[PDB]
């Protein structure tokens, strides 16, 4: 009748990470579409009671950011 | 036997599966840079000792 | 190969002896096919941006044709120059070396015994 | 009117068409003058008059 | 030829084989690269002084400056890798296998 | 033995490159590269390369290896000792060969004499020739200074671009 | 990235390539390569994702090892000839190390193990620059040292680059790795004819740059990075499928397309020098490249894959990407075979 | 293209028109939370430009004549058939949700384009940050599958990361029964078929997912039903916000230039809407694709670029 | 030779005093003690800014390495070229500092 065109079964063949997924090339995914892999913090200082520039007896739990 | 199997096998299909398998041997690398620089060192060793390209 | 020739006067597109050659005529079929490449460039430029292919950018297609003819003219001058310099080096080398080139004594086919191979 | 937002290519860009046609015709007259200068220089250097 | 040139070339090739065989760290790869640069610096200096070739005395300074800027570039690449993964281990750098 | 000071510093230089380049950890590798840079500097200084040896000690060690240890301080085995002693065995066997034969051949051929014999017997007057050649970077090395300064300005710009992360 | 800093950095890339092309001193050659690498590193890190940092790190390590081997070859040349003229070399060990260094800089096999990864990690524009502009300077140095190049070494690197560039792309769906293996195979084709006729080297280089620039420009214009995403292009702009059709048929070496021109001229020169087996094996290996090009053409142009519904929204919006010189680069990469004796302008 | 990198080099910096009133506002709420007139009132008090809720035909409103094209060319989806058959076999549900997400993505790109080119803040209605609130409700009520939610999360991961959050979120606490009474006073025979548990899942995903992550990356304002009516109280709450949270602080000229070069390329905004994850609710076969494309190409104003159409009377084509 | 004797003597005195400091009070047996910090046990977070000031030091140290032959280069017979290139190198160090300035690189360690 009319000119045949490929289907989803044909389309998902060309769409892996490789063309011939074998035993070695099996655990391979396509990358994220914008080539951005997910990123997979701030310091927490505890200035204890050991220090003269704190006036005597003080414990300071800081949260620095650099 | 001849003209759907064996003449169809001996020239094109054996070559096609051979190129398939050799392409799987080429492109099945684990991505590891250590292995690639190790292969580069093996190349310089073979080109110094085996084929004597320094001559 | 000819890199020792155009190094005494380097980076010359067309040297001073290139003007002694004839220039390509403006009806050169090489240059005409270059102008056809300009027309095809104008058509692809009107096609990739979804303009009307033949109807949009007649000034744009005219500048594509103008630009390709204007570049290809000097490219053909340099082409003719380099094949002329190739033949000049060849002829000067054959003239200045008679011992490297024997004039062949041309045996006529009455003296030449070729084997006959019968198709029977 | 047809379009809700005015297209960039609705009105012709007369500066762009002027630069296009002017640079094109300048290259055409420079090429014609170059070809006439080259045929005159050839017909002088090899002497074909 | 001269005996010390053998030693400097062998130090270059030992730093080569260190660079050409990763163990774990990328900083060690940069250190092997700069050991290669160090041997090149020494070998250039011994040649240029043994020749009494005066104008090339400025060449080892140029080698040192350009390859120290190269080393700073590599240290910044290492720092961005170790900001992404937490360490500069080379086995983290295999996402481009596929 | 005393006529062999460039050669003995070169043997220590090869041994130090085997020491760090077997890569225990980048801290001790930085240490071994620093000690190796010092003895290679001694190799340079014993040919009258006083400015280039001080360029080792100033520039190489006091700036760049300081930055390497600085980054090693922030960003962050049997194989090490085995490949270490393998390189030490290869080097001492090559030394024993070139000392028994006064000849060796691995890539090139090398004479086994004291390396003082490859020198010149002249003088240079009231100047170090190597110092005046480095001073000629300004009178003669105009293009060299232009491309070096432009590569360093681009180096600053490039570091600030790739470390910004935006 | 600042556009002013983008201008200065790309001009610094071009200035490094120019310093390699115009200088008569080996130190200035090495300086030009240092400037080139040092400037092109931020162009790879334009989007600031971990794959680009990984790719820039692998690129740095390979190019830095190549630059140190290049300087060692220069230093051996200063040992054995006392001079610095950029010309032939005066020692086959310096010749071998400089051939190794330039083969590393071109990503020729078996130093090919960075080009698909580095081309994969970086964007399409920086991949275009890496596969076209960064192939200029080491081919210039190989052009200037060719009286000293060992024939066995350059032909071994050439056959290994042609075979791996063939067999590498046969199992690939990413576009950038396909272009990278095509680069490795084409560098093999360039360096094989180099000691026979380097004009054909220049010819193959320029035609490869035109074809590669065409395909990367189409990939940028259609925002395609995989084969499967390239297969949606007919439902959005079918002229793009026709142009990637004819250009991928050109890049494999089909006549009458002008990518048949370089490899035909390479066989035309290598068979003059009585090498008949070697361009035959080269031409038989190029059919692998043409095979996965046929795969890409069937996936994109000559068929029509099923699409998704949101393409109907993209039917309404025109391309605003300034496709710079794309019709010129498509016309030149396909239809230049009648103008084949233009190759004498590279003499 | 009037704007590009050359317009950035020649002096035009987009913070030279970025005043305090230039705030992107997204007004949010349930299907009858009354936010419709509230967004227009907040827009007309502060002089901000109002962009309504993207229906099916927003992309028809931006291109061509502005009039709505047929649904077979834009969408291939019916909201009414979703209201009638929410568990439909033909896959209208996620196809409608994906088309609405692409429409809101286009509207959000237009919103940031207006904010960056004109320096005027824009009041929105259910931006892309509040589009999965209907997805998870349709999933909890079983209207679509797990793979549709996976496809949506893929498209959200590769679209919403390219954009900054809004400044002010004006959400309106309305109970479900008041929304149901407003639907029954509306009288729409399609809108009344919306069940109770669907609206309750909408409110659940609202109060438990949208506001707990927009409370930090931007500024929330959470009103009731009867105090979101006085517009002046809301505008007074907007004018006295300490703008200290959010990534709108670290946006100099270069980052907003990157954003402006992003949001004018609408095929780059809509680049990864059509990722080839062949999901049967949205996968169109090639014959129907070519048929709908060649019926769409015959529509007036659509065969060529928007200044190149003789059938709608674009003159001077022979000089363009 | 005299330099090597002086280096060996200074290194010997350093190692001798370190030997006396690590073995003469280590003749003590004193007592088997156990001894069981602002950060407790967590990993030291990287500081981008300290690395950037180290790289800025390295690049300006290379520019210093270019500037060091100036007291020798003042003796030259090409003095106009020497003054031009000397002012240009110090100018390039200043332009590197200006680009470090204006692009916010000298901030929070200014
Ligand atoms: C060449 C030698 C090829 C060696 C590899 C063979 C195939 C791979 C393999 O080993 O697979 C096992 C193994 C796994 O495969 P498998 O599990 O068996 O899967 C196969 C299936 O079971 C399928 O079942 P199967 O194993 O029973 O059948 C396999 C089939 C066996 O075929 C049959 O059973 C039917 C056909 C009979 C045999 C083929 C005859 C063809 C004759 C030519 C056509 C007629 C010409 C007439 C001419 C008349 C005048 C003389 O053989 C092939 O398909 C291989 C064909 C030849 C391969 C190379 C073709 C290159 C052509 C390039 C252009 C020229 O593969 C590997 O591990 C890969 C590495 C293999 C080892 C390395 C290669 C050794 C190379 C030695 C030196 C050669 C140098 C090159 C010289 C020639 C080229 C320049
Ligand atoms: C005379 C000395 C010099 C001769 C020339 C050089 C020597 C090498 C031969 C020519 C080159 C062929 C390739 C050799 C390397 C092997 C490929 C490889 O990496 O395989 C691992 C791997 C395959 O293993 P797999 O993927 O893990 O899976 C394997 C299965 O687990 C398990 O699979 P399986 O159980 O089937 O066994 C796997 C293995 C098994 O293969 C074998 O057992 C075959 C071994 C060779 C048999 C033929 C010997 C012929 C000797 C001369 C003739 C005798 C008479 C002499 C008299 C005069 C002549 C009549 O097969 C393969 O690996 C397939 C690819 C290798 C094809 C070998 C073709 C041999 C041609 C011989 C010409 C001579 O493939 C890759 O990784 C491919 C990517 C590598 C990219 C870089 C490749 C560079 C290669 C350069 C080689 C030439 C050196 C150049 C030096 C100078 C450079 C400037
Ligand atoms: C000439 C060759 C280049 C032509 C490029 C432009 C073609 C084009 O746009 O055609 C559309 C246009 C008709 O369409 P339209 O009315 O504008 O409406 C737009 C369509 O509806 C557009 O339809 P749509 O976008 O709505 O969707 C339908 C879809 C339908 O498409 C599909 O569904 C997929 C495609 C179908 C399957 C794949 C078939 C691929 C066939 C392409 C060619 C391959 C073989 C080429 C040779 C072998 C190498 C591979 O796409 C098209 O129809 C695309 C239209 C373009 C088709 C032709 C493309 C040609 C360029 C590539 C080949 C030429 C360059 C390489 C040549 C190699 C060496 C010879 O055709 C023309 O205007 C043709 C030119 C007619 C005038 C010729 C005058 C010649 C005068 C010569 C003397 C004067 C010059 C003197 C020079 C010297 C002065 C000094
Ligand atoms: C000799 C080597 C020459 C190498 C190529 C140099 C130019 C290309 C590189 C720069 C570039 O991207 O320019 C854009 C490029 C057009 O590429 P495009 O952006 O893709 O154009 C798309 C549309 O056409 C955009 O059109 P539009 O509507 O936006 O504006 C109309 C525009 C208006 O144009 C102007 O306004 C230009 C006048 C003002 C320029 C600025 C003055 C300051 O005119 C055109 O675009 C018409 C086509 C112009 C010619 C394009 C091809 C040029 C030849 C390339 C090499 C071909 C070699 C063939 C060899 C054959 C034999 C092997 O060129 C121009 O716009 C100016 C052409 C100047 C030609 C000079 C010829 C003599 C050279 C000596
Ligand atoms: C560089 C110039 C200045 C050099 C340093 C100053 C000069 C004097 C150096 C020697 C000082 C004495 C030894 C170190 C200090 C020991 C103090 C101490 O309590 O020692 C007890 C220790 C151990 O005594 P102990 O066994 O009673 O220790 C206590 C153990 N329990 C708890 C089980 C009871 O004595 C020694 O270790 C003996 C050291 C040598 C004594 C002197 C011999 C001649 C040295 C010359
Ligand atoms: C910007 C650069 C500004 C300074 C340019 C050089 C100034 C100078 O003294 O030049 C003369 C110098 C040296 O000439 P000279 O005047 O010292 O000549 C005396 C001759 N000698 C030194 C051999 C005793 O340079 C040149 O003549 C050519 C080299 C510079 C060419 C241009 C470089 C920049 C190119 C940018 C692209
Ligand atoms: C006389 C010449 C005889 C040989 C001519 C070439 C082989 C015949 C034509 C190419 C193969 C076409 C084909 O169908 O290959 C199938 C196979 C895998 O492709 P697949 O996706 O399965 O096919 C579509 C679905 N059936 O594809 C393969 O296995 C890959 C084939 C690669 C080899 C192509 C030719 C290489 C020639 C040079 C070898 C050196
Ligand atoms: C003998 C040896 C001597 C030398 C011989 C000649 C060698 C020529 C080598 C040319 C190398 C060109 C390198 C590629 C272009 C460099 C600039 C660039 O990257 O352009 C792409 C640019 C990216 O823009 P950006 O905004 O950064 O995009 C990011 C994502 N949108 O913009 C875009 O993406 C816009 C889209 C179109 C880009 C087209 C760029 C084409 C460049 C190549 C032109 C053709 C080559 C010259 C012709 C042959 C000459 C022999
Ligand atoms: N999944 C969905 N289910 C029902 N309505 C939706 C959905 N997504 C978007 N809407 C729209 O949200 C509108 C409600 O907003 P409004 O009536 O303006 O308060 C409806 O009229 C629909 O057009």
Curated annotation (Swiss-Prot), chain B:
The membrane-spanning stretches of this chain are: 31-51
List where in the cell it is found.
Mitochondrion inner membrane
What does the annotation say about its assembly with partners?
Core subunit of respiratory chain NADH dehydrogenase (Complex I) which is composed of 45 different subunits.
Q: Which family does it belong to?
A: Belongs to the complex I subunit 5 family.
Report the protein's function.
Answer: Core subunit of the mitochondrial membrane respiratory chain NADH dehydrogenase (Complex I) which catalyzes electron transfer from NADH through the respiratory chain, using ubiquinone as an electron acceptor. Essential for the catalytic activity and assembly of complex I.
* Protein name, per record: NADH-ubiquinone oxidoreductase chain 5
Organism whose genome encodes this protein? Ovis aries
- Span covered, complete protein: 552 to 606 of 606
UniProtKB/Swiss-Prot annotation, chain E:
Pfam families assigned to the protein according to its UniProt record, in alphabetical order: Oxidored_q2
Q: Name one GO molecular function term.
A: NADH dehydrogenase (ubiquinone) activity
Q: How does it assemble?
A: Core subunit of respiratory chain NADH dehydrogenase (Complex I) which is composed of 45 different subunits.
Membrane topology reported for the UniProt record: Multi-pass membrane protein
Localisation: Mitochondrion inner membrane
Protein name, per record: NADH-ubiquinone oxidoreductase chain 4L
Q: Reaction catalysed?
A: a ubiquinone + NADH + 5 H(+)(in) = a ubiquinol + NAD(+) + 4 H(+)(out)
Mind telling me which GO cellular component terms the entry cites?
mitochondrial inner membrane; respiratory chain complex I
EC top class named in words = translocase
Entry EC no(s): 7.1.1.2
Curated annotation (Swiss-Prot), chain G:
Instruction: List residues traversing the bilayer.
Output: 3-23, 25-45, 67-87, 96-116, 122-142, 145-165, 178-198, 200-220, 237-257, 274-294, 325-345
Q: What is its EC number?
A: 7.1.1.2
Q: Where is the signal peptide?
A: none
Pfam families tied to this protein: NADH_dehy_S2_C (PF06444), Proton_antipo_M (PF00361)
Which EC class is the enzyme in? translocase
Reaction catalyzed: a ubiquinone + NADH + 5 H(+)(in) = a ubiquinol + NAD(+) + 4 H(+)(out)
A molecular-function term among this protein's GO annotations? NADH dehydrogenase (ubiquinone) activity
Topology relative to the membrane: Multi-pass membrane protein
What is the protein's quaternary organization?
A: Core subunit of respiratory chain NADH dehydrogenase (Complex I) which is composed of 45 different subunits. Interacts with TMEM242.
Q: What does this protein do?
A: Core subunit of the mitochondrial membrane respiratory chain NADH dehydrogenase (Complex I) which catalyzes electron transfer from NADH through the respiratory chain, using ubiquinone as an electron acceptor. Essential for the catalytic activity and assembly of complex I.
Q: What is this protein called?
A: NADH-ubiquinone oxidoreductase chain 2
- Originating gene: MT-ND2
Swiss-Prot record, chain I:
Which key words are in the record? Electron transport, Membrane, Mitochondrion, Mitochondrion inner membrane, NAD, Respiratory chain, Translocase, Transmembrane, Transmembrane helix, Transport, Ubiquinone
- State where the protein is found: Mitochondrion inner membrane
Q: Name one GO molecular function term.
A: NADH dehydrogenase (ubiquinone) activity
Q: What's in the GO CC field?
A: mitochondrial inner membrane; respiratory chain complex I
The way this protein sits in the membrane is described as: Multi-pass membrane protein
> Which reactions does this protein catalyse?
a ubiquinone + NADH + 5 H(+)(in) = a ubiquinol + NAD(+) + 4 H(+)(out)
Positions of transmembrane segments: 3-23, 50-70, 79-99
Q: What does this protein do?
A: Core subunit of the mitochondrial membrane respiratory chain NADH dehydrogenase (Complex I) which catalyzes electron transfer from NADH through the respiratory chain, using ubiquinone as an electron acceptor. Essential for the catalytic activity of complex I.
Among PANTHER family, the record links this protein to: NADH-UBIQUINONE OXIDOREDUCTASE CHAIN 3
* Identification of the protein by name: NADH-ubiquinone oxidoreductase chain 3
Gene name per UniProt:
MT-ND3
